[PDB]
């Protein structure tokens, strides 16, 4: 059976390169402390989830414009 093995927390190495509108987005939730390089990964409303580093441009705006989810 060979589905998806291997997936510790989550851990995204990947960022996106591509500034999205907060329109429709909704917030973003942080990652784990066990990955090798953690940024955050965002969630819109209907769209879908992106892995961003709060270093970037438009992730920060997005960090203060939008609270956080996560539960």
């Known amino acids: 059976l060979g589905a998806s093995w291997h997936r ?10 591509r500034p999205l ?4 987005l909704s917030s973003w ?3 784990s402390q066990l990955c090798s390089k953690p940024g955050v990964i ?3 409303k209907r769209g879908r989830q992106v892995c961003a580093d709060k270093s970037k441009d438009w992730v920060k ?3 203060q414009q939008l609270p956080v989810t996560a539960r």
């Open 42 to 44: 965002f969630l819109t």
């Open 61 to 63: 705006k997005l960090m």
């Open 8 to 17: 510790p927390d989550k851990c995204c190495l990947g960022y996106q390169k």
């Open 21 to 24: 509108p907060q329109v429709l």
């Open 29 to 31: 939730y942080p990652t």
